[PDB]
Write a protein that binds this ligand. Structure first.
Ligand SMILES: CCCCCCCCCCCCCCCC(=O)OC[C@H](COP(=O)(O)O)OC(=O)CCCCCCCCCCCCCCC
Ligand SMILES: CCCCCCCCCCCCCCCC(=O)OC[C@H](COP(=O)(O)O)OC(=O)CCCCCCCCCCCCCCC
Ligand SMILES: CCCCCCCCCCCCCCCC(=O)OC[C@H](COP(=O)(O)O)OC(=O)CCCCCCCCCCCCCCC
Ligand SMILES: CC(C)CCC[C@@H](C)[C@H]1CC[C@H]2[C@@H]3CC=C4C[C@@H](OC(=O)CCC(=O)O)CC[C@]4(C)[C@H]3CC[C@]12C
Ligand SMILES: CC(C)CCC[C@@H](C)[C@H]1CC[C@H]2[C@@H]3CC=C4C[C@@H](OC(=O)CCC(=O)O)CC[C@]4(C)[C@H]3CC[C@]12C
Ligand SMILES: [Ca+2]
Ligand SMILES: [Ca+2]
Ligand SMILES: [Zn+2]
Ligand SMILES: [Zn+2]
Lengths: 669, 499, 670
């Protein structure tokens, strides 16, 4: 056989020429012809009302997708069997869904799809409103990580059907129209729904992009609903609603980066930030840094005035969040200056110096007390969710270790004749590490600035990717260190210096720890080429070890470092399109840290009727939400019929309508 | 036909293959549309390889066939239909899934429904593991990791016991295999920790229970090569790395027994080609390869997986650029060798070469010139190696100029070109990282699905039923094809561009 | 304080209601009240030329609505045209233009605008009448005619030249009035590219016109059906040889060359009689390459003895010819490598050495290579030889080889006193000869780069690097200026202060004591690999201020180079490689076609070591094939405009106009 004989494998019963002409009369719009064919179908002829096309197109279905209400009413007048034609009218977004609702195998829809689920999937406000007025219910999905008998039974029976039904339910719940129509609090519903869908995307590894898109849709809906505010009174009603900015705190808690970083929200936060400061930002920059320095040197007088007179005007100037931010920054800068003074010896016991270190201890105890106080309120999850909290916890633990080691050395104990594990030496080393961490904590203050802010946020965002590539490189380093130590440990010599930290580098690969250090320092070129030589004249062993060193250098410098550069290029291009959003979210968190009344004093001094009101607040919030939902519905309806464009379906609708008008004109004459 | 008219023959063949690869003709006239799509995509890929011209056309046709197969799999709305589709064989096996992996259908394999099916078969009898808390997962994985040998001897003495059937779970088997490999690397690390013997026997503390593990690795590689053929073995780079490391281990073992039964003296007086030294060097290289095989375990993890896959994809571009750099290196090496081989000296020096404190004779021979030009990328070659003992300033200037030209061409030019080119490559391949990571992870998963090779390395050493299977598969294909052509008409009449 | 808005410039005059009624009935298709208004115009109640808010007359309004009957009614009443033909041409309808033959910038014509809109039917019915367009001057013409119109209006002159060249570069005018559309497209693309080079202000329009001409040539070649007409078009001579393909190579038609039909034809010509090599397995391919490369001198000598028979026929295949040439160059490189191993026979001490067997082999090899280069100069131009970088590199390498052998024979004739190498002078002719020999060896092994273009794997990468080296040059200028500035500063500061310089075990402070030494010291600071240590910035007699200032200057130089300029170069390479990789396949195919065409000719067959009625029939065949290609191209592109062009708001307005016409007809009839 030199030719392929093509035949239909999946054959059907097809249609008679009379039934084909009847379907063509349905398609074109011959009302007289379909009426005559239906009248012939009442009597016992070949044409039946519930005919099935080989494509599964019942006459009611092709009548529905042609948007001809008279044809649909004609078929439902003669009791044509209705299966999932309501779903086809809903998916097409056709106003004949009313006629399908009041009217008393192969399906193109999943059996778990109900009319309300599909109407919410299509996001049509009118059809959703019609179905809810008729009375519909979406089944309640279970918890994200639950192990009840029903879920495991459905997973044992059909895991695909269970996952698809859960995804369809969450797609229906996450639609903007269903939240705008059927939810009591659309903002809270959107926040909790986005949180639930994010947890589902984390739990369900498959369908992860679907749940992430649904969470993004919920966040984007919340942002657009907030975008419809027309007065500052409505904004203060929304943001300060609780069931003080309680809703803004909730949006920060639910990671709603688009509800925040909105110009109205940022305007309100800036008004509450420079409170009682008319035209602060509309000033020259030099005057701004001059008055910032003036407040900075004047931190302790304001702190003492707050500690002795909170109701004084100078005791209320510190209560401004921006002024207290400058106060805390000045306190931290003075502490770092004291650390620099401490950085600028024959006694085993080291007492604190009579000037420098003695006032340093109040800042250390203030940092410790502030960390315990901040850990006590809010919880420990948000403590570990902030990396700066991990950094200052490490710094405070190191400072406590130095304090304890100094106390131990004072109550228990030349410098060159000390043991290498002397408590004074360990105390000085940990003090230097804590100084590094304390001076590295200054990068968290870049969030307030508008220039270093987004840069700092993005460069802190790619650190997870840095850690992944560091894991890969650490595995490579461990492999090559194992091999080089295995080759070179037979040639260990015992020479005051033994290691890579002297002028004549020797015994670089004799120890596994020394091999790790030698391979670590070879990235920067600080390991010379004579470290691969041995005392004996074993040129083969030296060549093989130098080949290992060359292969490791080639990987870790040419290959791995350039893969790291490429992946930081991709990450930075991916996260620079949202840099303003993340920076403004972090700046909002920094601002609301200082918005509260507690913790007003800096760290050197920080250690020293109802039902009627609730009903009125609920009524005001419901009125504002009604106005917002009306504005949002009108806007998205006006947006909906403009940016959608023209498909081939509406061209077919135009052709069918013009053909129907032509055939009606022919019937008239 | 090609001698009479080659352009007409090529156009006719392309038209025939364009007609055969259409989704509608396969859905309407093929007995098995999935097998037809898989085989058609394979032939179109081979034709794109053979026909250098019209390569984009055949590649587009192959992508269209793969996309059609993915859409036909998308219409499965039941788990029974998916189990019928994936387990179907032409003659719980997952034969069609193995066929799709063989035909390199990344989009078909990485579909979420079969991903969920493979995850269900992966976590065999694991209620709620996918929603457990992460450090609890780590603690349980550690607990199973320390308990690999008790499960292994339970499978040895009682496969019917629940303890012996716990190793039959693919996730537990993978965990025990990884724990075994970690124990092997721990023994490799202990080999270096804690001589003048010319005929040193293997120590009983570490090296004596290294040998059965090497035999287990060799037997496992032989069994993998027998069951599957040699083409898929050479297709995987990790199998080549494992073969290299096992050859090095066998050579180390042979050299050790040679040094035991022959050449039976202080260490510094040995020959430079002494068999013990060669055995130790090959053992070190095999240790590097064994510890570098741990990157293959990153595919199971969801965070390091796509990153490792992307690095593996960029390794080909790395080699492609290394060819060009090697040509540059040979050019400048021959130039410097031709300039500087006249000024070669011994002078009673204990050193000759670039690998000690006083670097000398850097470009005396071609091997030393290649070594010295190789180490100039990392800046371990000093500037005085271009100087001769004679007062010939012109040759010194020419050598310094050629060294600086090589340094510029490598470091400034070619390294930055490589940085930009892998920037573009990682931008290109990060869009499809998830599908290739899922394909590689599924290959790793059904590496552990078969009953054979269950044990870890130290312990490794009719017509009516077929007719009803064809009827069931044909009814599932009828439903899938009907749904697919319905969706084709739906998506096709909603094309957002109006002409 | 509120700005009160007012209409500064009057544009619309209402006057009587009849003008507004005429304007409203013109864009609604109300034919019967339009003819009533025209009858009243014949009575004299209103003016035909009415200006609306948009500034468009009734003729312009009905042309925009694309309505021929009411436009004919307007023309039958003697309405003023006022360049309404241009408006009908721009709206691209046949009927309005052919009924007009029964704002816009003044330098255009109906033919110019018709070619601008690229409408084939409008152009072919405007070409029925005799039409001549003004011939533009050359890109170097500066006569009195070109020096008089520019003084009057340079902007009008530039726009007129751009409009003329935009009319000429239209595809449909190339079909209608030219005997050879392919040659016209080639020459027009070349002229528009050199115009874009000359006219720096208007270079975008000329560049897009050159791209349009090249795309037209590629899509005209793409309509070839069988290989017979492909060999007809690709072998045509303006007045085997592949003259049209050589013209396409010359005119930088990268899209024409990279066409799949042209690439397949090139493959069939390139592989010759061994058509089964493409379908052979890879192992057989490497085996064939190795067998042809190993016995290349046997094939060369057998072709030299008897060229006619089959053993002189396999070398005539350009693929095997290229493999033989590559093996020839590889064994030349092997001789260069073996020179060092042979030369170690105590010949390193002789002042002028006697030439060994390898020296005679190498002098014969480079005489053969020089003869090949001379043949390439004599056959194919001079400037195109200087265009390609391999030719320049080979010329410089051969010049260095000639200088090496001349200095070697001069030293053998003159300096023939046996001594030790340590006592020689620096500028002795033997040392200069071996230095130039080392440079020639570097260039000879670097000439192996251009055999990568025929590889499908290493080809596009090498082409991309060669394309992106211009970024390195443009940045090299800036780095050279920065290096010169810091060299001046450090030399000025440090001039007051055995082994001297940085090429020492202990790099002394004397490296900054001279200008060339300072350039040397700052040159080894680029790589940031501690090639020049920081103690070279210390004065030898403890001047702390001068040493600290020099250290700060060196640190500023190191920052500006390493942490700024190198990262800038990485960024520019990122942008250049992202732009380049879009079309890297096309440039690789063009370079590979050039490399293949270099081997297609039979004038240079042997490797470097061993070295009318017919015209009228060809014109008739080429005209028939060109007419077929023109017809296929026209039908194909009209299918593309009917099938791929999206609808506009004007289409919806025309549909509403037709519906209102039918509504008015129903109203009048019923
Ligand atoms: C970890 C998984 C990811 C990485 C996977 C591996 C990818 C990289 C594979 C590299 C293989 C080793 C290459 C040879 C290294 C070696 O040991 O080489 C070592 C020897 C030097 O020997 P000594 O160290 O004994 O002097 O090199 C030579 O002998 C000279 C001739 C060979 C030179 C080969 C150079 C290849 C290119 C490497 C440098 C590229 C820099 C480009 C700058 C523009
Ligand atoms: C075959 C393709 C290979 C790849 C493509 C190569 C394209 C050409 C490469 C550049 C040209 C050859 C090198 C020229 C330099 C040279 O020969 O320089 C070689 C000499 C070396 O002299 P010494 O060794 O005596 O110091 O440099 C000098 O003489 C110093 C004075 C001149 C300084 C010129 C420096 C040019 C800039 C090069 C680095 C740019 C850094 C930019 C990033 C910050
Ligand atoms: C020419 C156009 C391109 C360049 C345009 C200008 C941009 C570059 C401007 C450079 C200005 C001088 C830079 C500082 C040099 C200097 O002060 O160097 C001067 C001294 C060096 O003193 P010694 O040389 O005596 O040790 O630096 C110090 O004293 C140390 C403390 C100051 C360190 C300043 C570092 C600034 C940042 C530079 C490194 C960035 C690394 C980033 C890694 C990610
Ligand atoms: C060695 C010690 C003394 C530290 C030396 C550096 C500090 C003096 C600098 C480093 C970073 C600076 C900070 C960088 C950014 C800002 C934000 C900026 O303030 C704002 O932008 C406020 C909000 C607004 O204006 O909208 C000025 C203060 C502050 C905290 C700066 C205070 C001074 C800091 C801590
Ligand atoms: C010196 C020796 C002891 C090696 C030291 C490092 C190992 C302890 C690490 C390095 C990489 C780690 C692996 C990296 C990734 C994974 C995947 C992850 O498991 C999964 O993701 C399983 C599949 C799934 O959950 O879907 C955790 C185990 C494992 C094998 C890790 C096991 C522990 C490994 C081998
Ligand atoms: Ca804190
Ligand atoms: Ca293996
Ligand atoms: Zn449940
Ligand atoms: Zn002129």
């Amino acid at each position: 056989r030199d030719r392929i004989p093509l035949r239909i494998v999946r054959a059907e019963s097809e249609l008679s020429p009379s039934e084909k002409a009847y379907l063509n009369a349905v398609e074109k719009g011959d009302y007289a012809s379909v009426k005559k064919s239906l009248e012939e179908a009442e009597i016992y002829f070949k044409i039946n009302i519930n005919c099935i096309d080989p494509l599964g197109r019942t006459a009611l279905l092709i009548a529905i997708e042609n948007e001809n209400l008279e044809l649909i009413e004609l078929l439902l007048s003669f009791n044509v069997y209705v299966g999932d034609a309501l779903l086809h009218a809903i998916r097409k977004e056709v106003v004949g869904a009313v006629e399908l609702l009041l009217n008393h195998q192969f399906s193109e829809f999943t059996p778990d799809i109900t009319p309300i689920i599909l109407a919410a999937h299509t996001n049509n406000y009118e059809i959703i409103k019609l179905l809810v007025q008729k009375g519909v219910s979406v089944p309640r999905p279970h918890e994200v990580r639950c192990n009840c008998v029903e879920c495991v039974s459905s997973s044992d029976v059909d895991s695909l059907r269970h996952s698809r039904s859960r995804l369809n339910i969450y797609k229906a719940l996450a639609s903007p129209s269903l939240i705008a129509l059927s939810s009591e609090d659309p903002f809270l519903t959107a926040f909790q729904l986005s949180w639930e869908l994010q947890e589902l995307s984390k739990v369900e590894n498959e369908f992860k992009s679907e749940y992430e898109e649904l969470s993004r849709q919920c966040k984007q809906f919340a942002k657009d609903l907030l975008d419809q505010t027309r007065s500052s009174r409505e904004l203060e009603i929304i943001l300060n609603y609780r069931d003080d900015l309680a809703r803004l705190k909730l949006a920060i808690k639910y990671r709603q980066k688009e509800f925040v970083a909105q110009p109205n929200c940022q305007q309100l936060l800036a008004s509450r930030w420079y409170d009682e400061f008319p035209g602060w930002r509309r000033r020259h920059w030099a005057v701004k840094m001059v008055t910032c320095f003036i407040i900075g040197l004047l931190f302790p007088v304001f702190s003492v005035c707050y500690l002795i007179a909170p109701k004084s005007p100078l005791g209320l100037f510190i209560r401004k969040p921006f002024i207290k931010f400058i106060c805390h920054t000045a306190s931290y800068l003075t502490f770092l200056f004291l650390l620099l003074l401490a950085s600028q010896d024959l006694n085993r016991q080291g007492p604190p110096p009579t000037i420098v270190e003695w006032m340093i201890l109040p800042w250390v105890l203030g940092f410790i007390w502030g960390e315990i106080k901040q850990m006590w309120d809010g919880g420990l999850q948000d403590y570990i969710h902030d990396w700066w909290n991990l950094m200052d916890f490490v710094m405070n633990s190191l400072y406590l270790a130095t304090i304890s080691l100094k106390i131990v050395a004072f109550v228990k104990y030349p410098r060159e004749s000390w043991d290498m594990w002397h408590p004074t030496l360990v105390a000085e080393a940990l003090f230097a590490i804590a100084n590094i961490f304390s001076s590295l904590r200054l990068i968290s203050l870049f969030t307030a600035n508008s220039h270093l802010g987004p840069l700092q946020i993005s460069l802190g965002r790619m650190l997870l990717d840095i850690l992944k590539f560091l894991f890969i490189y650490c595995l490579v380093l461990l492999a090559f260190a194992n091999g080089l130590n295995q080759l070179y440990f037979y040639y260990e010599e015992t020479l005051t210096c033994k290691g890579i930290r002297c002028e004549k580098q020797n015994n670089a690969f004799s120890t596994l720890f020394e091999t790790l250090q030698s391979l670590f320092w070879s990235i920067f070129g600080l390991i010379n080429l004579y470290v691969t030589n041995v005392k004996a004249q074993h040129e083969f062993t030296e060549f093989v070890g130098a080949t290992m060193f060359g292969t490791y250098n080639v990987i870790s410098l040419v290959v791995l470092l350039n893969m790291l550069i490429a992946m930081m290029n991709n990450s930075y291009q991916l996260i620079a399109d949202h840099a303003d959003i993340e920076w403004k979210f972090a700046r909002t968190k920094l601002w609301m840290s200082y918005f509260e009344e507690g913790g007003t004093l800096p760290t050197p001094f920080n250690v020293i009727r109802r039902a009627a009101d609730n009903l009125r607040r609920h009524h005001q919030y419901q009125e504002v939400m009604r106005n917002l939902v009306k504005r949002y519905v009108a806007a998205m309806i006006r947006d909906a019929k403009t940016e959608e464009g023209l498909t081939e379906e509406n061209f077919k609708e135009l052709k069918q309508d013009i053909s129907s008008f032509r055939f009606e004109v022919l019937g008239l004459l | 036909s090609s001698d009479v008219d080659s352009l007409r023959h090529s156009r006719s063949r392309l038209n025939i293959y364009k007609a055969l690869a259409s989704p509608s003709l396969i859905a309407l006239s093929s007995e098995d549309p999935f097998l037809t799509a898989f085989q058609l995509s394979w032939e179109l890929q081979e034709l794109s390889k053979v026909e250098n011209e019209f390569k984009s056309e055949y590649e587009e046709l192959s992508r269209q066939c793969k996309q059609f197969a993915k859409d036909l799999l998308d219409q499965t709305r039941s788990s029974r239909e998916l189990e019928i589709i994936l387990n179907y064989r032409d003659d719980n096996d997952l034969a069609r899934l193995k066929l799709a992996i063989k035909y390199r259908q990344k989009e078909f394999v990485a579909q979420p429904n079969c991903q969920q099916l493979l995850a269900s078969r992966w976590y065999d009898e694991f209620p709620g593991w996918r929603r457990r808390h992460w450090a609890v997962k780590m603690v349980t994985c550690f607990i199973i990791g320390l308990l690999f040998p008790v499960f292994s001897v339970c499978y040895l003495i009682a496969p019917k016991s629940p303890l012996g059937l716990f190793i039959r779970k693919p996730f537990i088997k993978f965990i025990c295999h990884t724990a075994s490999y970690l124990t092997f690397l721990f023994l490799l690390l202990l080999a270096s920790q804690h001589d003048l013997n010319r005929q040193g026997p293997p120590p009983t503390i570490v090296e004596w229970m290294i040998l059965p593990w090497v035999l287990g690795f060799i037997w496992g590689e032989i069994k993998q090569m027998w069951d599957g053929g040699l083409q898929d073995y050479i297709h995987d780079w990790w199998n080549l790395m494992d073969f290299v490391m096992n050859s090095l281990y066998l050579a180390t073992i042979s050299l050790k027994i040679v040094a035991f039964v022959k050449y039976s003296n202080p260490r510094e007086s040995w020959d430079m080609w002494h068999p013990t030294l060669v055995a130790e060097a090959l053992f070190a290289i095999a240790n590097i390869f064994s510890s570098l095989r741990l990157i293959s375990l990153f595919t199971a993890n969801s965070h390091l997986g796509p990153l490792q896959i992307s690095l593996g994809r960029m390794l080909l571009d790395i080699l492609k650029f290394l060819f060009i750099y090697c040509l540059v290196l040979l050019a400048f090496a021959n130039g410097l060798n031709q300039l500087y081989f006249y000024y070669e000296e011994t002078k009673g020096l204990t050193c000759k070469g670039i690998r000690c404190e006083k670097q000398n004779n850097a470009f005396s021979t071609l091997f030393e010139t290649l070594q010295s030009l190789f180490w100039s990328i990392f800046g371990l070659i000093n500037l005085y190696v271009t100087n001769v003992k004679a007062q010939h300033e012109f040759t010194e200037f020419v050598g310094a100029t050629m060294f600086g030209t090589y340094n510029v061409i490598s470091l400034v030019v070619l390294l930055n070109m490589l940085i930009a080119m892998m920037n573009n490559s990682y931008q290109l391949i990060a869009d499809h990282a998830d599908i290739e990571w899922k394909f590689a992870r599924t290959k790793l998963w059904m590496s552990y699905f078969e009953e054979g090779g269950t044990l870890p390395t130290p312990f490794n050493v009719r017509a009516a039923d077929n007719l009803r299977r064809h009827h069931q598969y044909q009814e599932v294909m009828r439903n899938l094809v009907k749904r697919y052509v319905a969706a084709m008409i739906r998506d096709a009449k909603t094309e957002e561009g109006l002409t | 304080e509120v700005m009160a808005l007012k209409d500064v410039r009057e544009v619309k005059e209402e006057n009587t209601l009849n003008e507004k009624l005429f304007l409203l009935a013109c864009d609604k298709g109300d034919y019967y009240m339009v003819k009533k208004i025209l009858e009243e115009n014949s009575s004299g109640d209103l003016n035909i030329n009415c200006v609306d808010v948009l500034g468009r007359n009734a003729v312009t309004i009905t042309i925009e609505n694309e309505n021929l009957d009411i436009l004919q009614l307007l023309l039958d009443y003697g309405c003023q045209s006022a360049d309404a033909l241009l408006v009908a041409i721009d709206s691209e309808v046949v009927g309005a233009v052919d009924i007009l033959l029964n704002s816009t910038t003044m330098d255009v014509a109906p033919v110019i605008l018709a070619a601008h809109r690229n409408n084939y039917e409008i152009l072919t019915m405007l070409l029925k009448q005799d039409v001549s367009l003004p011939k533009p001057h050359a890109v170097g013409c500066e006569c009195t005619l070109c020096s008089a119109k520019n003084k009057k209006d340079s902007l009008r002159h530039s726009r007129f030249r751009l409009d003329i060249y935009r009319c000429l570069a239209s595809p449909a005018l190339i079909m209608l009035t030219e005997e050879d559309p392919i040659l016209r497209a080639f020459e027009l693309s070349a002229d528009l590219k050199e115009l874009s080079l000359v006219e720096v202000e208007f270079r975008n329009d000329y560049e897009e016109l050159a791209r349009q001409c090249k795309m037209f040539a590629k899509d005209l070649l793409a309509q070839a059906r069988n290989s017979r007409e492909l060999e007809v078009i690709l072998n045509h001579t303006s007045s085997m040889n592949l003259s049209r393909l050589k013209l396409a190579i010359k005119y930088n038609q990268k899209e024409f060359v990279s066409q799949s039909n042209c690439q397949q034809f090139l493959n069939t010509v390139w592989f010759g009689q061994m058509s089964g090599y493409r379908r052979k397995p890879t192992c057989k391919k490497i085996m064939t390459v190795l067998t042809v490369g190993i016995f290349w001198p046997v094939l060369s000598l057998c072709y030299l003895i008897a060229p006619k028979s089959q053993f002189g026929r396999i070398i005539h295949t350009p693929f095997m010819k290229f493999i033989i040439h590559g093996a020839s160059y590889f064994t030349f490189l092997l001789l260069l490598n073996l020179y060092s191993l042979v030369y170690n026979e105590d010949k390193k001490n002789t002042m002028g050495p006697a030439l060994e067997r390898i020296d005679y082999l190498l002098i014969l090899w480079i005489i053969g290579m020089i003869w090949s280069d001379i043949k390439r100069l004599w056959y194919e131009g001079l400037e195109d030889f200087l265009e390609e970088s391999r030719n320049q590199l080979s010329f410089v390498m051969n010049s260095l080889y000639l200088a090496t052998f001349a200095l070697k024979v001069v030293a053998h004739n003159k300096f023939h006193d046996f001594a030790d190498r340590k006592d020689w002078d620096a500028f002795h002719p033997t040392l200069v000869a071996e230095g130039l020999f080392a440079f020639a060896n570097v260039l000879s092994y670097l000439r192996l780069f251009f055999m990568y273009t025929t590889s499908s794997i290493l080809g596009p990468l090498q082409i991309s690097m060669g394309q992106m080296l211009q970024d390195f040059g443009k940045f090299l200028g800036m780095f050279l200026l920065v290096l010169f500035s810091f060299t001046i500063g450090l030399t000025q500061l440090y001039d007051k202060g055995d082994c001297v310089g940085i090429f020492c075990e202990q790099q002394s402070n004397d490296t900054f004591h001279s200008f060339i030494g300072t350039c040397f010291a700052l040159f080894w600071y680029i790589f940031s690999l501690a090639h020049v240590a920081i103690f070279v910035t210390r004065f030898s007699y403890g001047e702390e201020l001068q040493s600290f200032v020099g250290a700060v200057i060196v640190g500023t130089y190191n920052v500006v180079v390493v942490i700024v300029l190198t990262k800038l170069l990485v960024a520019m390479l990122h942008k250049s490689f992202q732009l380049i990789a879009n079309h890297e396949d096309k440039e690789w195919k063009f370079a590979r076609a050039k490399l293949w065409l270099s081997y297609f000719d039979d004038k240079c067959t042997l490797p470097p070591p061993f070295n009318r009625n017919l015209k009228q029939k060809r014109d008739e065949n080429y005209q028939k094939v060109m007419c077929c290609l023109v017809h296929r191209y026209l039908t194909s592109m009209r299918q593309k405009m009917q099938s791929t062009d999206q609808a506009t708001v004007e289409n919806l307005n025309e549909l509403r106009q037709d519906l209102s016409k039918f509504r008015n007809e129903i109203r009048d009839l019923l």
